[model samples]
Target: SVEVEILLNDAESRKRAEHKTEDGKKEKYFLFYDGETVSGKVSLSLKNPNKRLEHQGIKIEFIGQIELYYDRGNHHEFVSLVKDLARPGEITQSQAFDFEFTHVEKPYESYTGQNVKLRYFLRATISRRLNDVVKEMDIVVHTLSTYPSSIKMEVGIEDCLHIEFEYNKSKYHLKDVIVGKIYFLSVEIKIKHMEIDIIKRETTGTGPNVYHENDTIAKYEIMDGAPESIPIRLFLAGYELTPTMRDINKKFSVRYYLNLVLIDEEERRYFKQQEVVLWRKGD
Candidate 1:
């Protein structure tokens, strides 16, 4: 039997490969971020070192891709580079191929959503007549951010509802707090309850065949009526959030939105959606 493995530059690279959840139980992962070089070695080994193994050739690839979990066979490769190791060679012991992708232009942060996963990895393959031996290693990428200005918006629904809301800033770090206020001016419908929701929107593909997915990160009850003022404070430390992505290499995008929902006695719901930006602070 033959074995193939990928060895990263250092243990530090593997340690920083995962994103831990708040409770420290769940781990969501992929590499580290934009402009970071991922270099490693692909090792091939065999149980019988004295036995010669013949293969057509060996190759390694550095790739960034988006995959739809529901459709595993369909993969969109945004970044791809291949390197050849040997040409129809025979080896008796073991072999190692050192590879490097320097300052790769990774335009989007890696993310794992409900049905889609955007990621980067190193893949090594050995071509053979019967079958091909393949190995893959995943990596994570993080994007740097700058302080953003505050945001304010006024929303109205004809003569039915009117409200004003404001957040401290338009961009928030993963560990940042969203501090803001909402004021209700006019209310015609009998309000049953009000809530604020954090939503993550993922858009893949384009044109008529485009796919979109929305996942609610969190929900908090704010009030039960209108004509009043309320304060809101949301912590981003506990939830998994994809950084705000805009037209990522014209492939896909991940965005966050603050959704204000007002329900009436008749079970009717009114929603006001405001786009917000999320980022990772520099170390």
Candidate 2:
């Protein structure tokens, strides 16, 4: 019947969030907090000037839902808010509708995973006799967190092999600076190679159909001669991190791990794992 478009005013540049779609590789979405006020405008433009459009129900739906590849029919829709724009009528010309959703709290962070993906949006629906012409205005949500700790771990091999690894902080946001250091206090055996790996454990489904996929995000070489006092500085943007998606409506969870692996020519293995928390917020 008509083309529906949504627009929002963005005055703050730093607070803008990115919504990565399949095309263009870059698009900015107005950032939203857990319980923030969201306001926007909807446009209705007639495709044909001579044709009068008859509408049944014209409205906008605010929604946040989880999409699972395994569940085809039932999409776990957690947030569903509706805004009626107009009554059943005939439109011979273009029109505009304003909408404002009173402060809302998005319980979970935006997630993108292998088996599950969650998203938020505003839907413009034009229900008529022919079909329901629907358009979605996608949005992004990021959560806030606080931590008072540091990532300090000690790995020791009984009679020998004592080492310590510590990152600058225990929590980090995306694309932020990450600094660390590894120390080897004692070594009693010959070493062949030493490296660290960025790994993520992605879990999907639950109970009978539960699934876990363990994959390495990246492998970083530390030293071949087993050197001590190794400093680490990872420009996170250059690395691929699946920014920790803790829960997907209890259907999925994505956790990251940093692994320190040391191997020797004698086939002895030394391994340690440290989990890190990742967040997304304005810089």
Candidate 3:
């Protein structure tokens, strides 16, 4: 049996994490940051440590790909770089191919959304005739940022409702708690009830695939009475929220926004939406 395995440089010595996966079986993942050099090795081991194992070719690749549901074969890759390990080679005992890529321009952090998933991985193909003994190793990326800017926004209808909203910062870690406030400037209608909700939205992947969707992940009642310097608080825990991705590669994005809605006695509703950034922190 031929075995293919990947060993990262200082994988255990450096920082990393394992997160909740969709299948309930989370795995330990390596950590990487933007502009950080990525380097690893692939080990090709022959079961018997044979003197000779003939092959067609051996190759390895570094790829950044966008995944939409349909294409199991065509993974939309924005970055594809390869290192040819061997060509029409014959293996003896065992071997290791050490590869390195420096200052790789990966624009977005690895994210998995319902509509799409994006990742960077190492792929090795021990090219054989009937089947190619291949292996794929994925890495998780954490993008740090400077201090986020606070958001202050005002929205309302003239002669009907006027209000102002303020949030501490526009960016939050996945485990962070959100804090904010709302102020009422004018109210001419009968305010029935008010509520706030956290919503998730996503877009298509360009592998001959396209879809747009939005859904609410968390909803809470704010107040039933008129706004009187209302206080706002929301915990991000328990609600698996995704970080805000811009329209990346001019293709797709997944974002989180706060939806504040007010209902009048006549059942008419007024709403305001605010975008927030989320990132993976020391988890």
Top model number, lDDT: 3
The alpha-carbon RMSD values of the candidates against the true structure, listed in the order shown, are 3.4, 2.9, 3.2
Clashes of 3: 0
Pick by lDDT: 1 or 3, better one: 3
lDDT of 2 by residue, 27-127 (tens): 77766778876777788899897899998978988899987767756778899889999889878898888888887769887766666677888898988
In order, what lDDT does every prediction score? 0.77, 0.76, 0.78
TM-score, one value per model: 0.85, 0.85, 0.83
lDDT of 2 at 65: 90
lDDT of 2 at 201: 90
Off by over 4 Å in 3: 19-25, 49-52, 70-72, 148-163, 171-177, 184-190, 205-210, 224-227, 236-239, 278-283
Per-residue lDDT of candidate 1, residues 186-240 (tens digit): 7776778777889988887643466888889989887535356888899999997
Give the 10-residue window scoring lowest on summed lDDT in candidate 3.
141-150
Model 3, 77-175: lDDT tens digits are 988888888988788878898888888767787776665678888899888777888899887776665443458776668887877778887888887
- Among all windows of ten consecutive residues in candidate 2, which has the lowest summed lDDT? 7-16
The numbered model that scores best in TM-score is 1
